[PDB]
Design a protein around this ligand. Sequence first.
Ligand SMILES: [Fe+2]
Ligand SMILES: [Fe+2]
Lengths: 521, 521
Amino acid sequence: SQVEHPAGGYKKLFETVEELSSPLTAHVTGRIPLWLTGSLLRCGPGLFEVGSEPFYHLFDGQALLHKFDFKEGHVTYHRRFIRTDAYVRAMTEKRIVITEFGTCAFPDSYFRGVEVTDNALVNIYPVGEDYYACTETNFITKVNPETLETIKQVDLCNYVSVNGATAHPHIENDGTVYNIGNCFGKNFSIAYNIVKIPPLQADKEDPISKSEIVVQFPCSDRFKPSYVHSFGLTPNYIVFVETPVKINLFKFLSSWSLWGANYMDCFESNETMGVWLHIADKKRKKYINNKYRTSPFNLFHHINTYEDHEFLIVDLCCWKGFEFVYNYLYLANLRENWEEVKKNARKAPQPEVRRYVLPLNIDKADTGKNLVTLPNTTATAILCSDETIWLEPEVLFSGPRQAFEFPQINYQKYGGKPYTYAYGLGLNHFVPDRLCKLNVKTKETWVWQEPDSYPSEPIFVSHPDALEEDDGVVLSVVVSPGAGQKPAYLLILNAKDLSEVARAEVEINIPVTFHGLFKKS
Amino acid sequence: SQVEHPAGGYKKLFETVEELSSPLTAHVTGRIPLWLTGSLLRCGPGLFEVGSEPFYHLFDGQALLHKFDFKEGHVTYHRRFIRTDAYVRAMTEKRIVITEFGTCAFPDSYFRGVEVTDNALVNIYPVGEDYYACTETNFITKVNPETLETIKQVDLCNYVSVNGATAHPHIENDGTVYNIGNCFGKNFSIAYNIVKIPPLQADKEDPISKSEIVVQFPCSDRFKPSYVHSFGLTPNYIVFVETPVKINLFKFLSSWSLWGANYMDCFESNETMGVWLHIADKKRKKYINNKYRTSPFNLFHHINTYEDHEFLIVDLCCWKGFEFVYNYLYLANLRENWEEVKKNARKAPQPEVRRYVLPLNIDKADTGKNLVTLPNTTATAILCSDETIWLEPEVLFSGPRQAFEFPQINYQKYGGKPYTYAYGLGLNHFVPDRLCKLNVKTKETWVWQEPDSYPSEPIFVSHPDALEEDDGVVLSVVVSPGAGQKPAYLLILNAKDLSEVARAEVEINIPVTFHGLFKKS
Ligand SMILES: [Fe+2]
Ligand SMILES: [Fe+2]
């Protein structure tokens, strides 16, 4: 790493905090643009222990909903814990009641039904007129975006046939929400279903009640689904990537009744499988039977996806290797001293942004040849006798233990479409270190960074009279735990330069946050 | 391609030329450094047809030996065809007598012994006090470096047990020559032998007569060796890369006696095998049984190789895919018009410079983890249950149909050792387009280029009082067929800047040349 952090400020990203009864006024450095009048809503953990019972993993902490509101002249900050079953039961009983991702709860009997986690710390997104905080299970939580108050719990299994769903659904311009999850295939097998929730209608009834299944992807292993964090979507195509990080459902049903495990205990890695890629015709609702294959890696975040003549351009934030990257994300290890953090990540998967290019229409004549005839890429697709199609990427970004993660674009105008710029959070040995801009064509980058300060995902907000793709700002929440300073602040950067425009400073700490959403109010 | 060549000047790289009875004086532009007093010797084809019988492939043309001599104030140029059997028989009979790589000769009987090609057009290199021009067979040709006169033919099978050898042997500082070739393994199989020729001795007897076998690499396929263009060498290790381009010996013995084929007709591609990598202890003369594996690609030129703690850093000029790149190098297609050349290379393998990193000492405890713990690389090595080690590279250079090829370094001081800079020939859709410098650490590059001019491999000559790695010049022969101009000229660039220092211009054309050698006279 170019940059070191011997002071260990990043510890404060994983430290419990309390709620606010009502919003704080933020002190403002610089000038806020007058056009920017909305609400930045983000999610993340906020309570990392229940008394003397600690949560162990990064994705175990109880969900905390954050809001930076730019209404009138000032900026305000507010935060409330989401009154989930996981939270409400824990506060009631002064203990950990619901098993989280990596923290297993124990009884204080008569067992009767597994209590799948409710803890929606990962993300928030809009369905119709409403907003839903979520995790990666079937339970999503309706919230009030004005007040941050918890409205309702929704069980997705009541409407669609899926076991869970990602916290990275795609939202179309008309409001239609797409998402992917595990299901049971028609013949004693596992598969992946694409869920479609339509936009609100004149009759005004709940859009979720009109949820449906578009298509079903098959599973490489009959009784083991891969882990799915997100997927790709274009106007005509749906793209799903099957990684070697498999879920071993066997283990959780065994240990639940017998010993007592958690979610992380079910994960295993398929050594010989590599990475399978899948395409579906979105409109015809067909799975296109094209056996795209490539070498092993973990994938959490798609960056963007789009069509180019008879090809799909697929940009991904990868991690080279089949070992589960989440292994490296226990809070005990993230709260280590800097020297020990770097040591711990030495044998970790190596991050790399990759452009994969999938030919849509294959022909047997070109068996044994590179099919990617596009002029401006070095990505490769080889047609074999297997009838499998072996892929090689065009690398866009690669730094030793430096990850371009939590990717974001101008999603409203360019999501699913040809594009040039992507923005992301820099991870220095897993510690969020800096903010990054990237030209996906030229590979040129820009970096914002300051010492002893640890920012969140950079969300792009378009200029209402934008002429270019990068015409707008980037919001990021920044934690600066240095001595004689403001614990944290919201950062606002000009998306062109990546230069600083303003700051909304606060007198209290903010923990790590994962994903969010800007609401143009 | 950024650069186009609609004029089609590159045609002149594949046009027959005659010899010179005696050297020409070159006209000099700029100032030649006073320290540079030696001989640049290069090889390549020079006769592309015998009357009305044409040679078809790039590597069929009859060998032509070139010399740029910087002796006293002036520069001189000379060239002679190498009096090989292939050449001598052809001139005698006014026809193609010996089957070349891609051009098959036909009878004008009683067959008795295959006549393997003598045509040493690829390269030249020194053994003891002598110099040997070579191809990729067992026949190498001794030449006079002062006069360019043909001295003798040498059959390597007379001394060592090998079927052939590469035109890319490694020469150590003490003069010892290492090289690799196909052999017959001890049990009815094929293998690869490392040949070692020692330096000249006090007794003054021929070093070749003291040739020996160091070690033997095994072959992935029992009856099919891969194609081997070059290999890697460090002070302690020998590195060999086994590609999916296999030789099908069956075919040549069948067609020779029956129909009548050539060398290119035996090549086939192993779809499912990928690329196997091999290491040997140079000193103990052992093959290290480590099953390094990775995805398919063609490899012709190693760039450099060196040791870093318990790791081998391996830099390669790759071509993504298992199809044989030589398919794309018939003279008929290289003499096409520019638009057709680009079309022909659309489905070709994509060039890419890659850094592969091989761990020397593997431990079972780390099975399923990334073993490459070095700080300044994104290359990966995964230990499996197979006990195979799956590799991912750190990409150093990647341009659409733009190849960094014919790589060269400051080989005397840094070959086999840690290094920073490498120099190469830019290939625009296979047409040699430009010259390149590359920082293998930072990836920063420099480019020299001028319109309607097509250069050769850039050879590095060190400054006698060098303080840095790039302290020296780069020689390249350049063909500028534009109207109202000097057909060709030798280019001399400052290796730091890649800026032009001088030119030795000539009034006659020079065809393509492959590899060479600077002789500090
Ligand atoms: Fe995520
Ligand atoms: Fe070569």
